[PDB]
């Protein structure tokens, strides 16, 4: 019984900066039996509206949030 919510995604960014690839990997195909497109579509609609900030960490782009 696993569900995806905006609060859950933001929680990770609020605690530690992460990348889109890392976020998707969390529920890419671990347990949730959701289609690859569906998984991205759900997080995309939520993340896309997130309009967060980008930071250069280890020569890479990461997502960070400051409530």
């Amino acid at each position: 019984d696993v569900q995806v919510t905006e609060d859950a995604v933001r929680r990770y960014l609020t605690r530690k900066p992460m990348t889109t690839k890392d976020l998707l990997k969390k529920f890419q195909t671990k347990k949730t039996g959701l289609s690859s497109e569906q998984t991205v579509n759900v997080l995309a609609q939520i993340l896309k509206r997130l309009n967060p900030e980008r930071k250069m960490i280890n020569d890479k782009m990461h997502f960070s949030l400051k409530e």
Binding site: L23, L24, K25, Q28, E37, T39, V40, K48, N51, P52
Partner: peptide, 21 residues
Amino acid sequence: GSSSEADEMAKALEAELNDLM
């Protein structure tokens, strides 16, 4: 390489936020 199609799976997500970025 060992991976390819899987990488694109995440690219779609980044493509969205890429706008507001």
